[model samples]
Target: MRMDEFYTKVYDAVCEIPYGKVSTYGEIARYVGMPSYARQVGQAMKHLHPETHVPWHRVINSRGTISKRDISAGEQRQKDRLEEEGVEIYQTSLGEYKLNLPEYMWKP
Candidate 1:
């Protein structure tokens, strides 16, 4: 699909995630009819405009962890927002935080 069209579908799928719920990048991609565009979903989120209503924080990696980036602070902000929504964050033995996929993943 066209890049602009993909972005619109991704944003629309993301907007469907209810508050306090989370979906994986793969999940959103599939929801928007692009089953193989999980990474593209992440890219779309990375470029989300500040004024956009998309709840960018509601998407995570397939491993149930927030994908690491150069900006550790931004990752923390995402974690904080998820916590505020009552989603429990799990810390691995290595100290990486993740969400429990089976417990929190949205199916719709």
Candidate 2:
């Protein structure tokens, strides 16, 4: 297990998701052949730079929502990016953003 022996592997997988579509961090881990490393998938995402083209915004939780940490307004950036790709986001009562996975999920 390259065990993140290469971060680009994860980054490239996320790139497979085209505009107007999204996937889950857990699915990414599995895509990379490490089903148990979903949380680590989040860790890898944290390494992405604002200048990146990896489409980190295209990855969300399995529950169809964005989960925040001590994270950045990059969370806000995530919503903005996805919305521009034609993904309609729902603003929950708590001000969190959500998506309709059935409509936007990338099956690859």
Candidate 3:
């Protein structure tokens, strides 16, 4: 699919995630009919405009973890945003916070 179309699909899938829920990049990719384009989904999210209304924070890695990129401290902000939305965040064995995928992952 074209790049703009791909971004729109990814954004739409992200917007569908209800409040207090989360989805993996792979999940959004599959939802958008691009199951193998998880990385591209991340790219789309990375470039999302600040004025856009997409719930970009609701998207995470399949392992239920957030990205480490320091884009204006976005990693911490993403975690904070998710917590503010009522999604439980827990510390993993490695001392990093992660969402309980089985509990909060959006099935739709």
Candidate 4:
């Protein structure tokens, strides 16, 4: 798919995530019909405009963990944002922020 089209679909699928619910990068890619484009899904999110209405924070890695590579708000902010929205956030012993995938995943 065209790059623009890919991002358009990615943003749309992102908007489908309900408040307090979470989805994975791979899941969103699959929803957009690009099952193997999970990395591209991250790309669309990485460059998303902050003021856009997409709940970019609700997308996490398939392991139910927040990615530390995010630059805007810091991983701490992602953890805070999810908790504020009522999703449980767990910090592993090594400091990785994670969620219980089976309990919080947005099944769509």
Candidate 5:
């Protein structure tokens, strides 16, 4: 599919994610009718531009971790955005992090 088409699908899936909730790249792929293309969904998110107006920050990894590297400046931005919306985040281990996926994971 073309980039625009892919982006629109990504944006639509992102929009479906309710406030204070999160979805995984694999989930987004499945929702968009491409259940086998989780990596491609992640790539789409990585390339998503600021102008898209999609809540890209609302999407997290399958393991309930944020996708951006910790060293990335955008990581804080993403965390802050989610926190503001009342999503609980906690460290599962000394260096491991996790979002309260049980409370926030959106199926649709």
Candidate 6:
């Protein structure tokens, strides 16, 4: 698909995420009919324009982990935003954090 089409799908899927709910990159890919391109969904997320109302922060790894690359700088912003929305995040060990997937994971 064209790049714009890809991002449009990603944005639509992201917008569907309910408040205080979260989904994985793979799930977003599947919902958009691009199940094989889960990682590409993440790439699309990174390119989402700020003006759009896409809830990119609500998308996490399949294992419910945040992106390590975003840690230390802007990742905390994402975590804080989620926390502000009443989502609990657990840190199993220093530098390792995960969402309480059993409680907060949203499939659709």
Better of 3 and 6 by lDDT: 3
Q: Least lDDT summed over 10 consecutive residues: which range in candidate 3?
A: 67-76
Model 6 stretches astray by more than 4 angstroms:
50-52, 70-72
TM-score of 6: 0.87
lDDT tens string, model 3, 1-104?
79998888788888899999999889888888989998899899999887888999999898888865555654777888898998878777856678788999
In the range 44-77, model 1's lDDT, one tens digit per residue, is 9989777777899999998999887565446787
* Tens digits of lDDT, candidate 6, 1-108: 787887887888788899999998888888888889888888887776667577888988888888675523666767887898799887776675688787889954
What candidate 5 gets wrong by more than 4 Å, as runs, is: 1-3, 68-73, 94-96
Worst lDDT 10-window in candidate 2: 67-76
Decreasing lDDT order of the candidates = 4, 1, 3, 2, 6, 5
Overlapping backbone residue pairs in candidate 5 total 0
Candidate 2 off by > 4 Å: none
- State the weakest 10-residue window (summed lDDT) of model 4: 68-77
Cα deviation at 31, candidate 5, in Å, is 0.7
Q: Candidates 4 and 5: which is better by TM-score?
A: 4
- The collision pairs in model 6 are none
Residue-by-residue lDDT tens digits, candidate 5, 1-108: 666797688888788788888999888888888888888888787776777778888988998987746455556677788889988776555554577778789855
Model 3: residues with Cα > 4 Å off, grouped in runs: 70-72, 93-95
Query: Pairs clashing in candidate 2?
Result: 2-5
RMSD of 2: 1.4
Global lDDT of each model? 0.86, 0.83, 0.85, 0.87, 0.79, 0.81
Reference-based TM-score, model 1: 0.90
Which residue pairs of candidate 4 clash? none
